[PDB]
């Protein structure tokens with residue numbers, strides 16, 4: 738793996754979004770990953786629909802929670818691999834209301850064929866990220882609640898409860914760090930991002946890493 742990668746500098750990351758008062762973190766994680774994989778395959782960056790997942794994925798529980806694994810499963814096996822654009826199916830669940838699935842004649846922004854689980858190994862994860870693009874990960878978000886910036890080095894690491902997007906890392910920092918896009922608006926953290934120390938499995942970040950496969 739290279740010393741540093743930041744997919745924001747390669748055009749593969751959309752602006753920071755806000756889930757609002759809905760526990761839809763798992764949907765943001767999933768969609769952020771597909772946004773990045775679709776761009777890295779050689780297509781234009783396009784904002785895709787979390788609402789499609791919140792309202793239509795029947796394996797997961799909308800604002801009550803979900804898993805990236807299940808969302809990828811639903812997309813491929815229940816929705817023919819298709820992901821609608823945000824413009825066609827915009828996010829309305831920020832107030833916690835969950836409307837019924839609409840699905841009819843939406844604009845398709847991206848298509849995926851499969852998804853993969855990555856090894857529970859920070860170096861393997863770094864290598865795959867460097868070659869392939871931003872990855873869906875789960876963390877213990879206990880220490881995120883009080884974060885304002887800097888590199889978090891004493892992250893509570895006990896129970897996975899949040900899905901975020903891994904967008905880069907820097908091994909030429911003391912300490913080395915991962916760069917993570919959160920879904921709590923650009924007013925949280927470092928313009929919506931958090932840096933956590935790399936190499937000490939901070940927040941249990943290595944435990945549940947996955948990605949869609951395009952093509």
Ligand SMILES: *[C@H](CS(=O)(=O)c1ccccc1)[C@H](CCc1ccccc1)NC(=O)[C@H](Cc1ccccc1)NC(=O)N1CCN(C)CC1
Nearest residue numbers: 759760762763800801802803804805875878897898899900
């Ligand atoms: C998002 C995390 S959040 O942004 O921190 C958040 C939002 C709102 C309230 C608290 C925290 C959601 C939160 C789910 C939630 C809803 C209502 C009250 C409390 C919590 N977290 C999840 O959906 C997690 C994500 C996840 C992904 C991968 C691995 C582990 C966790 N999913 C989750 O906790 N599940 C999965 C589905 N399930 C049946 C119960 C457990």
